[PDB]
Write a protein that binds this DNA or RNA. Structure first.
Ligand SMILES: Nc1ncnc2c1ncn2[C@@H]1O[C@H](COP(=O)(O)OP(=O)(O)NP(=O)(O)O)[C@@H](O)[C@H]1O
Ligand SMILES: [Mg+2]
Ligand SMILES: [Zn+2]
Lengths: 569, 223
DNA sequence: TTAGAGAATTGGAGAGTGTGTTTTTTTTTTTT
DNA sequence: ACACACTCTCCAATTCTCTAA
């Protein structure tokens, strides 16, 4: 009956006030926040008692129950009244697990009853619903009662229930072996862990791998009973922004996507898309769109696809899509039959999952127009209306669209106007904020530096790799860039009278010039949407400075950008 | 657990003694006036307000908020016991179902069949509304307040409350109160004369005697 | 002659056991 | 949890036989 000594070990481990008192402090915090689970770091346990630590990982169940009882006794010794508020306490684990860190592919039947640490990408969820643990019945005519664990009438207030949910984890597709589809596993979430993860999240789950029963065919289904769930995704920024020696926005734009050479204005516009504008609301109930949309058109081999694959790696909550490989149902939402409950419910599509994020559409000119009808409502209003599976609803799909396409006839024709080369409808072309045209002008002076840069890139080898190796199948630093952009997304700067005056006067001047100009010399007409674009771009530039005001410099930069985009051949 | 008899007397005391400084401060004892109207069949439902209870006994309010179903039954029985004291008048006969009850009284000379009133709670002003996502399993059995948009509603259907049967041979009647969403009906007479003689009389259900209530189903959705 | 008590055979009243149970992607012909 | 089909048992109703009113 050594488990009574094992519980005794855990209780004297938890009583660490004699040695710097970290865990007693954590338990005190748990009490103050009215909580009922604790998170223990396995490194500390391994340091204090090697035998107990190395036994815990290979006997998850029999050891964790002893640990839970030790915690219950310790909190009761601190405060019995608090200990009586909850039926039982729980403990979760963190740290380094060594050999027990696995994936949904490498996890096999020999891991049963070990503590395991699985990681992958979440693909689906069931709905939260209650489960019974103890039921009670009472008789008022006799003052009598009975109980059961898992005449008289049921006592819902003396009975007690707890929450239950199921989710599914999938292997990272980048790590799949050659020529095979990804594998997956089912995770069970219970009590205070429900709804801590949603589809598209990258998670790392700690739990115990276990069979479920099922005459018998001698065959079982295996599930991971979760024990903890984890997610993954100042002075430096202060002194850097305080310098004011140079236009910081130009330096950040120059440093964007170092592999790709040229295309200055495109990089500046993409940085404005990453920073975004700001929303505003009016007393009549109307509101102004804060997010930005961008379109790219051009010849073969001008790095259009690579810029999309870069933004997708350097922005939070970003999604890919290709014109030929996707459907309107897949873009918005699809009805699904739940196998846990049997019920019919909706499942999110690509543009819904990109809410408060970015969505990249490659090969945009190959979509059927019926899909573009779905994209129209999303890009204009940020909402999507659905009328299926007994639900009439207005879902949230607020996102910035970055899209790329190739011109009609494959190679752009100099002897035709922009509206002739571009294959899209004039209604749709009016929705994007900025439209860029890119061309492979075969100048030898430019080919010299381009070819040199490409060849420099192909001779590199990483410092952690040796002279002849080959990989298996399966300027500002990037880290600072991410942190600076992340802080800059809070500032919410405001207009100034001078910037407003400048924008108004300059817009009137631009309108007069456009009135003089002809469709043979412009991509699209200029209207109030131009003012909205100018305001968004000036706001974003002020945001990059972290200046609380929108200044004349921001407005001047914004108008120069749109001037280049609209009034160059 | 509490003695629900003591709690019944406390509830009676609240109904008998509470005045809200009511009728422009004239102290006319709102619930006493309501009991007069209920006794004279002027009114059907009675909404007891928990803010009124809080003036005298906040512990009672807390007792009600958890395991509300017990206190629903308790208040209903208290009101039924107090109703004759606020009666002074004889009411005119106006309903076929009550004509059967009148015949039953005339022939005699369960309470659920006679209990022609409804009792409901109006939530305490302390309790802010939850969203449909925050009503988790720790709230089972407890009084709650929720906010949302209606999506669908059914027509009004008759819901059975107590069934009334008649016996072909012995001329007696039998009753069966209903509580669960389903039930099973009776078949053969349980009265002592039929049973002792094993005479085999059958039971016929009477829609003219049994009691029904208006029932409707609805769905509500998040903003 | 008519009727009741003690012994033998048989019907059926009753219990126990075993078992069943609209909403999305892709192809093919013929209409345009 | 709630209905058919089947098997089986014990209690006491119906008749034979001997006897008294
Ligand atoms: N300026 C450049 N810097 C770096 N690589 C470049 C540059 N221009 C072209 N490339 C190369 O161009 C190749 C193709 O890039 P890609 O993004 O597919 O071009 P694209 O404009 O999208 N052409 P396409 O997809 O056929 O319409 C890549 O392998 C790059 O290495
Ligand atoms: Mg490409
Ligand atoms: Zn009867």
């Amino acid at each position: 009956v050594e488990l009574r000594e094992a519980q005794r070990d855990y209780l004297d481990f938890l009583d660490d006030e004699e040695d710097q008192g970290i865990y007693q402090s954590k338990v005190r915090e748990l009490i103050s926040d009215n909580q009922y689970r604790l998170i223990v770091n396995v490194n500390d346990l391994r340091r204090k008692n090697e035998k107990r630590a190395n036994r815990l990982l290979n006997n998850a169940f029999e050891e964790l129950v002893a640990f839970q009882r030790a915690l219950k006794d310790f909190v009761a010794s601190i405060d019995a009244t608090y200990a009586k508020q909850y039926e039982e306490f729980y403990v979760g684990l963190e740290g380094s697990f060594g050999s027990k860190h696995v994936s949904p592919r490498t996890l096999t039947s020999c891991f049963l009853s070990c503590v395991v640490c699985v990681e992958g990408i979440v693909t689906k969820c069931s709905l939260v619903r209650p489960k019974v643990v103890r039921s009670v019945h009472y008789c008022p005519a006799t003052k009598k009662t009975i109980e059961r664990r898992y005449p008289l009438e049921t006592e819902y207030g003396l009975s007690v229930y707890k929450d239950h949910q199921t989710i599914t984890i999938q292997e990272m597709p980048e790590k799949a072996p050659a020529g095979q589809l990804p594998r997956s596993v089912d995770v069970i979430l219970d009590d205070d862990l429900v709804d801590k993860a949603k589809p598209g999240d990258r998670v790392q789950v700690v739990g115990t791998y276990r069979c479920l029963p099922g005459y018998t065919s001698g065959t079982f289904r295996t599930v991971l009973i979760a024990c903890n769930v984890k997610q993954m995704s100042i002075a430096k920024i202060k002194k850097f922004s305080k310098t004011r020696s140079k236009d910081i926005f130009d330096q950040l734009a120059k440093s964007l996507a170092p592999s790709i050479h040229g295309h200055d204005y495109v990089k500046k516009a993409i940085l404005c898309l990453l920073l975004g504008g700001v929303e505003r609301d009016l007393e009549n109930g109307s509101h102004i769109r804060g997010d930005i949309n961008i379109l790219l058109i051009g010849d073969p081999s001008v790095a259009k696809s690579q810029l999309l694959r870069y933004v997708l790696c350097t922005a939070p909550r970003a999604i890919p899509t290709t014109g030929r490989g996707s459907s309107g149902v897949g873009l918005t939402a699809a009805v699904t039959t739940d196998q846990e409950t049997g019920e019919r419910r909706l499942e999110a599509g690509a543009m819904v999952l990109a809410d408060r994020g970015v969505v990249c559409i490659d090969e945009f000119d190959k979509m059927s127009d019926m899909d573009r009808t779905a994209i129209h409502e999303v890009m204009e209003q940020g909402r999507v209306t659905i009328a299926k599976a007994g639900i009439h609803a207005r879902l949230n799909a607020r996102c910035s669209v970055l899209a790329a396409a190739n011109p009609v006839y494959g190679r752009y024709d100099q002897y035709k106007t922009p509206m002739e080369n571009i294959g899209l409808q004039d209604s749709l072309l009016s929705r994007f904020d900025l439209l860029f045209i890119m061309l492979d002008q075969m100048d030898p002076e430019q080919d010299r530096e381009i070819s040199d840069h490409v060849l420099r890139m192909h001779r590199y080898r990483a410092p952690g790799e040796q002279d002849g190796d080959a990989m298996p199948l399966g300027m500002v630093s990037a880290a600072f860039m991410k942190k600076y952009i992340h802080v800059a997304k809070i500032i919410k700067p405001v207009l100034t009278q001078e910037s407003a005056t400048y924008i108004a006067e300059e817009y009137s001047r631009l309108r007069s010039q456009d009135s003089m100009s002809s469709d043979t010399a412009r991509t699209s007409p200029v209207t109030a949407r131009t003012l909205e674009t100018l305001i968004r771009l000036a706001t974003a530039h002020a945001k990059a400075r972290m200046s609380k005001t929108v200044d004349l410099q921001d407005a001047e930069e914004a108008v120069e950008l749109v001037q280049y985009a609209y009034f160059k051949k | 657990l509490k003695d629900y008899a003591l709690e019944k007397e406390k509830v009676k005391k609240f109904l008998q003694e509470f005045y809200q400084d009511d009728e422009l401060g004239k102290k006319q004892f709102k619930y006493g006036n309501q009991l007069v109207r209920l006794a004279h069949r002027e009114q059907v439902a009675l909404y007891v307000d928990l803010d009124d209870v809080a003036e005298d006994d906040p512990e009672l309010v807390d007792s009600i908020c958890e395991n509300a179903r017990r206190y629903a039954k308790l208040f209903a029985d208290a009101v039924q016991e107090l109703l004759p004291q606020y009666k002074e008048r004889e009411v005119v006969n106006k309903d076929v179902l009550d004509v059967y009850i009148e015949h039953r009284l005339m022939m005699e000379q369960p309470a659920e069949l006679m209990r022609r009133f409804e009792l409901y709670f109006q939530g305490p002003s302390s309790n802010k509304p939850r969203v449909i996502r925050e009503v988790r399993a720790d709230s089972v059995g407890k009084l709650v307040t929720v906010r949302g948009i209606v999506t669908r509603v059914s027509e009004v259907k008759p819901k059975m409350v107590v069934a009334t049967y008649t016996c072909d041979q012995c001329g007696a009647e039998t009753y069966q109160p209903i509580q669960s969403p389903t039930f099973m009906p009776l078949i053969m007479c349980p009265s002592q004369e039929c049973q002792t003689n094993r005479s085999g009389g059958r039971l016929y259900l009477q829609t003219r005697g049994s009691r029904f209530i208006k029932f409707q189903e609805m769905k509500m959705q998040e903003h």
